[PDB]
Design a protein around this ligand. Structure first.
Ligand SMILES: NC(=O)C1=CN([C@@H]2O[C@H](COP(=O)(O)OP(=O)(O)OC[C@H]3O[C@@H](n4cnc5c(N)ncnc54)[C@H](OP(=O)(O)O)[C@@H]3O)[C@@H](O)[C@H]2O)C=CC1
Ligand SMILES: Cc1sc2nc(N)[nH]c(=O)c2c1Sc1ccc(C(=O)N[C@@H](CCC(=O)O)C(=O)O)cc1
Length: 186
């Protein structure tokens, strides 16, 4: 198994969701960035693993589930088995990450990407060791009912460059946004 990473898009007021979807209208190139980051694996013969809560799973359009080219894992303590289309089910983040070490996955998984929601982002952000956050800053306020936890900048350093991530301001549908990469090690 390789690196541990979170990825999120967040408004200025720290919103990530409203009513089971995103706070903003569809930003097609932003979605494509999510796809490219989470799918792209530098290691031959491996895929990346995506870890998500149950509501996040059901917020992805059924036509796009499972996220293609990635191993899809859902966190739930109420489900008895993975939802239709998903590959794995875990009862805790610690369990999911230990599973990547088991014989069924140990040599299949390159990067791990945590794709939300709010509880798993908060727990991940405080997981030991080396972790990166790929954050899209949506530069407007949007009504939301689900929020991103606080990024502790004493530990998470905003990187001044990263290969493959555009540095300039993007704009779709009249909404400006920018890509950021943070890293901690503790
Ligand atoms: N802007 C963006 O980047 C993102 C936006 N979103 C949005 O956020 C909303 C969904 O997020 P949110 O409401 O936070 O919900 P989650 O996706 O976190 O789903 C919560 C459910 O997942 C299970 N769960 C969560 N964490 C764990 C855990 N560590 N171990 C075991 N089970 C866990 C629980 O299910 P159970 O009760 O079955 O145990 C819990 O009720 C939607 O609006 C979605 O569109 C989501 C991700 C990213
Ligand atoms: C669950 C997360 S993490 C995240 N991080 C960033 N930067 N942007 C987001 O919008 C999301 C979301 S919400 C989301 C909902 C649907 C999809 C989706 O349907 N993705 C498909 C299709 C992508 C595409 O149509 O461009 C894919 O990754 O293959 C992706 C993310």
């Amino acid at each position: 198994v390789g690196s541990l990473n979170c990825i999120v898009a967040v408004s200025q007021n720290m919103g990530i969701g409203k009513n089971g979807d995103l706070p903003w209208p569809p930003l097609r190139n932003e979605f494509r960035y999510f796809q490219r980051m989470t799918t792209t694996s530098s290691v031959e013969g491996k895929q990346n693993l995506v870890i998500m809560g149950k509501k996040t799973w059901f917020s992805i359009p059924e036509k796009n589930r499972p996220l293609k080219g990635r191993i899809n894992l859902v966190l739930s303590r109420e489900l008895k088995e993975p939802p239709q289309g998903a590959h794995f089910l875990s009862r805790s983040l610690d369990d999911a990450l230990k599973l990547t070490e088991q014989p069924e996955l140990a040599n299949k998984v390159d990067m791990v990407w945590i794709v939300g929601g709010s509880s798993v982002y908060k727990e991940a952000m405080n997981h030991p060791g080396h972790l990166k956050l790929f954050v899209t800053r949506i530069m407007q306020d949007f009504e939301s009912d689900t929020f991103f936890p606080e990024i502790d900048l004493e530990k998470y350093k905003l990187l001044p460059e990263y290969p493959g991530v555009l540095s300039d301001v993007q704009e779709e549908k009249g909404i400006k946004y920018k890509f950021e990469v943070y890293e901690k090690n503790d």
